[PDB]
Design a protein around this ligand. Structure first.
Ligand SMILES: O=c1c(O)c(-c2ccc(O)cc2O)oc2cc(O)cc(O)c12
Ligand SMILES: [Cl-]
Ligand SMILES: [Cl-]
Ligand SMILES: [Cl-]
Ligand SMILES: [Cl-]
Lengths: 114, 114, 114
């Protein structure tokens, strides 16, 4: 899977080891192997949520499967919790878009997963 | 909803109030309450449109509903007009991707909209 | 069409002319004129692939049509090859998400493709 976090929180407030923690936690939550997990954090962004420039985050999780009603609720609770605890962003200032990818539409290692 | 603009226009050329203006304009255009509108502007990007690095933008609008042929035409005029007036980006150098998101696939506040 | 690459490779390692090379190669691969190809390269990103911060890339190719199993396999071989030769990124550390966009959901020049 691929998880991206865009936030207006400054780079210095992203703690050491945050990307590894995201990798390991997504491994547990999605059940996917850590070797297949890519994570991307983008701090210092020019963003607003509800018109306010208070800390916020816009995120996306793309995955071949393991996307669905109940699963996405669980990811949101896990990921919002991480963003609140580590980046001090309130969960009502976080959007996470979920994408269930067809294997034919994910390229990796000169091929696709299909 | 969520609106993101990636542009090679420099940070100093993004006028004060641009995020506030986009928020307010998207609230009226989408009919969604301003509280639900998130905006993200990413200047200073390494980008080309048609092979040239004159001002350009790649944008996305994600919304639970309020996406469709006629509505997206209206958004495109609104958003190209704003990018042209405020960022001096020609409308023929702007791409906007529109995403009609299922409520189950938008996470917010430890849960999803479903 | 639109091609985006996010990578942890530093700005200085993106060779001069890389955006033009991507423009021309994607024009040939998609069959669309270069005037309609947009490219966005984002270096120096805080990213991990498989828990490792060795060079990697997360990419997306959005196209109105010209997306499918066999085409995406061919795009992946082409794009992994360019990233490996030009950015020295191993193909097993590249993800490319492919998006077949509906004509109604792409805005350009105050209009939509539809
Ligand atoms: O060639 C087009 C195109 O590749 C694209 C395009 C835009 C975004 C995207 O994610 C994928 C696309 O192919 O959009 C167009 C919109 C128009 O109104 C007219 C066009 O000729 C295009
Ligand atoms: Cl996956
Ligand atoms: Cl929404
Ligand atoms: Cl969706
Ligand atoms: Cl679409």
């Amino acid at each position: 899977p691929m998880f991206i976090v865009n936030t207006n929180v400054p780079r210095a407030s992203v703690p050491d080891g945050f990307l590894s923690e995201l990798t390991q936690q997504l491994a547990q939550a999605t059940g996917k192997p850590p070797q297949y997990i890519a994570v991307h954090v983008v701090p210092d962004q020019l963003m607003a949520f509800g018109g306010s420039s208070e800390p916020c985050a816009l995120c996306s999780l793309h995955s071949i499967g393991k996307i669905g009603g109940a699963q996405n609720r669980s990811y949101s609770k896990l990921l919002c919790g991480l963003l609140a605890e580590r980046l001090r962003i309130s969960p009502d200032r976080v959007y996470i878009n979920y994408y269930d990818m067809n294997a034919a539409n994910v390229g990796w290692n000169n091929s696709t997963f299909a």
